[PDB]
C-alpha cells in the first residue's frame, strides 16, 4: 500500500511536483490528491527525473502541503461519454455540475488521443448555409469542416456563434456539443437556460431526447482546467463521431483560452519562452488538439470555434497558428463594428476553401469575387476620400464608392439572438436571395 502512492514534492501555483518512490506514472496520466478540500486531479505532464513527475492541477492548489499523498489512477483523465451526457453539463474531469445526479455513461473515455490517420480523412466539400449574408456569400461554411470566428474583445464573436447555434443547430439532425473554454460563467448559464426553454435540453425523465452536451471550463477556473476542457469537449464529440456514427456539431467558445492557459503553466514548467510570451510548444499543442476535430469516414464534426485575438493583433502567434487549421475563417473587425455594421465581419479578411467555382457554382462565385472587388477598390480610395473628400474622385470611381458603401450596409444583418437588446427582429436570409440581392 506504500507503493503506487506519491507525495507532493513542491507546489508552484497550478504546477505540482509529485515524487513517486516505487513506480512513476506515464505522461498524460491522471492522479488524485488525498485529503484536499475539493477533488484535486493532477495530470502528469513531465518526468523531471529523480523519481519526480511534474503535474498540472485541474482545480486550485491552495491548501496543498508538501507531504500529501497522491494516488496514481493508472490512466489519463477519463470522462463519461455517450447519449447519457446529452442535456448535461460536465466540467473538465467529467463531473456533473448541473445538479441532475450522476451521468449515465455508455463508456468512460480518456480525453487524450492521437489524431485520426491519413486513411481516415474525408474529402467532401458540401456547403452549410447559415442564413447570414456575409457568411453565405463571401466565405461559405463547409458541412463537415472547421470554422473559425476571429475576434477582438467586443466585436461580436459570441453573438455570431449564438446565431449559428440559432440557425444551423436546429436544422441539424445530429448532436451538438458546446465546449465553453475560458468564457464568462454568466454566458454558460444564459446558454443553459436558453436551451432548456427551447427544448434542446430536457431535464428529468425526458433527458434522453436532448440534443446538446455542455462542457464548461469557464474563466473562473485555474489554467489547468482551461487547458484540458477543450479535450473533454472533443471526447464527447469524438464518441458520437466514431462509435455512434453521428454528424456532430462542436461549438468551442474561444479556443484561444486553450492556448492562453497552456502559457500560464509553461512559465512554471521551466521552459524558455517562445515569441511574444507563449509556450515553445504553441503549434504542436494547438495542432494536437485541432487535428482531432475532423470529418472521418465514419462521422463528421462541423466545428465552429471562436478565436480571440489578444490586442486586436492578427499577427499574434496564437491567432496566426489557428489560421492554418481551418477551412473557413470569419475574421471580425473592430473598425467595422464602430460603423454599426453587425455582424462585424471583414469581407477582405474572411476566407473559405468552399469559395471555389467548382464547388459552389460559377454564378455564386462570380458575385462574391465582384463584391470583394469593389470593396477592395473602396479601400484603395480610403485615404484620398479622407484627406481630399469625394469631390476629387472620378465619376467612374464615385460609382465604385457609392456601390461599395451600399453593399457594406447590405452585408449587415439583424440576428435572432440580438433582437433582445437591439429591438429589431432577426432576419434569416436564404442563399439564393443573397446571390440575387448582391
Amino acid at each position: 500500500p506504500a507503493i503506487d502512492a506519491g507525495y507532493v514534492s513542491q507546489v508552484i501555483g497550478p504546477v505540482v511536483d509529485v515524487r513517486f518512490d516505487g513506480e512513476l506514472p506515464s505522461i498524460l496520466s491522471s492522479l488524485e490528491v488525498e485529503g484536499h478540500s475539493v477533488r484535486l486531479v493532477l495530470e502528469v505532464a513531465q518526468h523531471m527525473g529523480d523519481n519526480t513527475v511534474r503535474c498540472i492541477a485541474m482545480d486550485s492548489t491552495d491548501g496543498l502541503v508538501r507531504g500529501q499523498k497522491v494516488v496514481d489512477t493508472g490512466s489519463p483523465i477519463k470522462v463519461p461519454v455517450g447519449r447519457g451526457t446529452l442535456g448535461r453539463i460536465m466540467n473538465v474531469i467529467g463531473e456533473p455540475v448541473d445538479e441532475q445526479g450522476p451521468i449515465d455513461a455508455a463508456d468512460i473515455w480518456s480525453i487524450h488521443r492521437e489524431a485520426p490517420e491519413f486513411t481516415e480523412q474525408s474529402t467532401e466539400q458540401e456547403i452549410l448555409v447559415t442564413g447570414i449574408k456575409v457568411v453565405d456569400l463571401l466565405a461559405p461554411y463547409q458541412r463537415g469542416g472547421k470554422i473559425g470566428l476571429f475576434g477582438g474583445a467586443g466585436v461580436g464573436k459570441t453573438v455570431l456563434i449564438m446565431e449559428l447555434i440559432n440557425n444551423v443547430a436546429k436544422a441539424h439532425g445530429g448532436f451538438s456539443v458546446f465546449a465553453g473554454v475560458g468564457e464568462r460563467t454568466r454566458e454558460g448559464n444564459d446558454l443553459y437556460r436558453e436551451m432548456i426553454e427551447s427544448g434542446v435540453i430536457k431535464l428529468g425523465a425526458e433527458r434522453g431526447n436532448s440534443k446538446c452536451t455542455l462542457v464548461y471550463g469557464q474563466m473562473n477556473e485555474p489554467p489547468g482546467a482551461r487547458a484540458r476542457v477543450a479535450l473533454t469537449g472533443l471526447t464527447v464529440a469524438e464518441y458520437f463521431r466514431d462509435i455512434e456514427g453521428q454528424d456532430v456539431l462542436l461549438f468551442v467558445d474561444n479556443i484561444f483560452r486553450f492556448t492562453q492557459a497552456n502559457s500560464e503553466v509553461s512559465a512554471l514548467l521551466g521552459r524558455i519562452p517562445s515569441a511574444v510570451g507563449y509556450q515553445p510548444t504553441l503549434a504542436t499543442d494547438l495542432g494536437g488538439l485541432q487535428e482531432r476535430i475532423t470529418t472521418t469516414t465514419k462521422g463528421s464534426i462541423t466545428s465552429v470555434q471562436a478565436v480571440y485575438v489578444p490586442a486586436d493583433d492578427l499577427t499574434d502567434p496564437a491567432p496566426a497558428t489557428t489560421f492554418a487549421h481551418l477551412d473557413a475563417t470569419t475574421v471580425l473587425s473592430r473598425s467595422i463594428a464602430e460603423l454599426g455594421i453587425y455582424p462585424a465581419v471583414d469581407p477582405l479578411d474572411s476566407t473559405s476553401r468552399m469559395l471555389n467555382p467548382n464547388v459552389i457554382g460559377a454564378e455564386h462565385y462570380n458575385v462574391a469575387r465582384g463584391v470583394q472587388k469593389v470593396l477592395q477598390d473602396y479601400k484603395n480610395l480610403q485615404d484620398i476620400i479622407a484627406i481630399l473628400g469625394m469631390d476629387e474622385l472620378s465619376e467612374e470611381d464615385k460609382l465604385t464608392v457609392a456601390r461599395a458603401r451600399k453593399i457594406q450596409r447590405f452585408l449587415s444583418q439583424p440576428f435572432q439572438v440580438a433582437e433582445v437588446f437591439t429591438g429589431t427582429p432577426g432576419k434569416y436570409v436564404d442563399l439564393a436571395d443573397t446571390i440575387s440581392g448582391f
Binding site: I27, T284, Q290, T315
Partner: protein, 383 residues
C-alpha cells in the same frame, strides 16, 4: 580548491584504517540488501533521465554519434541532437507519452535516413519515410541519409532548361529555371499553394509529351498543414494523374516537432534520387515558415538560447543547407537537376520578418503574392 592538490588527493594519505578495514566487508552485504531497487548499470545503451515535451534526456549512450537515430524500448524513434558531458538530448519522433524515466534507449548505429528510389513515386509518406497512405510498405526502394551536403562549384552547371509552371503570370514575368530555387512568399490565403499545385499539375501534362529524360518528378512536402488539407490534395493529384510522378511527404500539425523539422530534409533526399540519376526533380517545401517554428520548439526545449523572435541562431543554416541542395548538376554527374519552391507565409505583408528575410537571401527568385492584389480580381496575385 586548485586541481594540483586535488589530483594529489588521488595518492593515499589516510594514515589509519579503522573504516577501510571495517566497511569493505560491510558494503557488499549492504548493496545486496537493496539490489531490488538497483537498476542495472548502463554504458553503451541508454536510460531516460527525464522526458517531457518531446525531449528525452538520456543517461549513458557512450558511443552515440551526433544526429544519430536512437530507439527507445517502447519502439518510438529518437535523434541524438546535443551530446552533453553527462547526458544526451534526444528529440522524440512521435508521442513522448510512451517514454518513462528509466526506459532503456537503444542506439541504432545509423544517422537519420529515409527510403529513396522509384518506389516512393506515388506514395504518401510521413516526415521520416513511413507510408501513411495505407498501401503497404515501400518496395523497390533504398535508404539514404537526410543530411547530404549540397553539390559544390565543380559539380554544378548553369541553369538553362526552363521547367515551365503553367502559370503565365509566372512563366512570362518571373521565369523559373531547371535548377533554380524560387520562393513563393505572401500572406495567408493569397494563393501560395495554388502556384505550387499548378506547377505539379503542369508537369503531368508535360511528362506525357517529352522524350523520357526531360520528365520532371515532383515532390510535395507538406509541413505543419492539417491532415485533411493533405488528403484534399492527394485527391486532386490522383484525379489528375499527377500522383504518378509525385511523392508526398506530410509531417502534419499533429506530428512531433522533430518530424516537421525533418520533413523538408526527408523530402529533399527523396527528390535528390532523381537529381543524382540524371532525371529532373521539383520540390515544394510548402510552409517552410512552419518548419522554422518546429525547429524553434526543439531548440528552446533543448535549452539552446533564443535569438530573434526566440528563433535559434542557426535558423539561417536550417534553410540555407536545405535549399542549396537544389541544384543543376554537371554532365559528369548525369546532368540532372532539382528545383525548389519554398513557401514562406508572412504576417500582414511584413516582408521584413526574420525567417522571411533569410529565405529571400537564400533563394534565387521571389514570387510575391499580395492580399490586396488578390481581392482586385488579379488571381494569381503576383506583385
Amino acid at each position: 580548491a586548485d586541481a594540483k592538490a586535488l589530483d594529489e588527493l588521488r595518492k593515499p594519505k589516510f594514515s589509519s584504517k579503522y573504516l577501510i578495514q571495517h566497511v569493505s566487508q560491510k558494503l557488499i552485504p549492504a548493496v545486496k540488501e537493496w539490489e531490488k531497487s538497483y537498476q542495472p548499470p548502463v554504458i553503451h545503451l541508454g536510460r531516460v533521465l527525464s522526458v517531457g515535451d518531446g525531449i528525452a534526456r538520456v543517461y549513458g549512450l557512450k558511443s552515440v554519434q551526433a544526429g544519430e537515430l536512437v530507439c527507445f524500448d517502447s519502439g518510438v524513434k529518437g535523434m541524438a541532437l546535443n551530446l552533453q558531458a553527462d547526458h544526451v538530448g534526444v528529440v522524440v519522433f512521435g508521442n513522448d507519452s510512451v517514454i518513462h524515466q528509466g526506459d532503456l534507449v537503444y542506439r541504432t548505429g545509423q544517422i537519420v535516413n529515409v527510403p529513396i528510389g522509384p518506389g516512393t513515386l506515388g506514395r504518401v509518406t510521413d516526415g521520416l519515410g513511413q507510408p501513411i497512405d495505407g498501401k503497404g510498405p515501400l518496395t523497390n526502394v533504398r535508404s539514404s541519409l537526410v543530411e547530404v551536403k549540397a553539390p559544390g562549384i565543380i559539380a554544378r552547371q548553369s541553369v538553362r532548361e526552363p521547367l515551365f509552371t503553367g502559370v503565365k503570370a509566372v512563366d512570362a514575368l518571373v521565369p523559373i529555371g531547371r535548377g533554380q530555387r524560387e520562393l513563393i512568399i505572401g500572406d495567408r490565403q493569397t494563393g501560395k499553394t495554388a502556384v505550387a499545385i499548378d506547377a505539379i499539375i503542369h508537369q503531368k501534362n508535360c511528362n506525357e509529351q517529352v522524350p523520357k529524360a526531360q520528365r520532371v518528378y515532383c515532390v510535395y512536402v507538406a509541413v505543419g498543414q492539417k491532415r485533411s488539407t493533405v488528403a484534399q490534395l492527394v485527391k486532386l493529384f490522383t484525379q489528375t494523374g499527377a500522383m504518378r510522378y509525385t511523392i508526398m511527404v506530410s509531417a502534419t500539425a499533429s506530428d512531433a516537432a522533430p518530424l516537421q523539422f525533418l520533413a523538408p530534409y526527408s523530402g529533399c533526399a527523396m527528390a535528390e534520387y532523381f537529381r543524382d540519376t540524371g532525371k529532373h526533380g521539383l520540390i515544394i517545401y510548402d510552409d517552410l515558415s512552419k518548419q522554422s517554428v518546429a525547429y524553434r520548439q526543439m531548440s528552446l526545449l533543448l535549452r539552446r538560447p533564443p535569438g530573434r523572435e526566440a528563433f535559434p541562431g542557426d535558423v539561417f543554416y536550417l534553410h540555407s543547407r536545405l535549399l542549396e541542395r537544389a541544384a543543376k548538376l554537371s554532365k559528369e554527374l548525369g546532368g540532372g537537376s532539382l528545383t525548389a519552391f519554398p513557401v514562406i507565409e508572412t504576417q500582414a505583408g511584413d516582408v521584413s520578418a526574420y525567417i522571411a528575410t533569410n529565405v529571400i537571401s537564400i533563394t534565387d527568385g521571389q514570387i510575391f503574392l499580395e492580399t490586396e492584389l488578390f481581392y482586385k480580381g488579379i488571381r494569381p496575385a503576383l506583385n
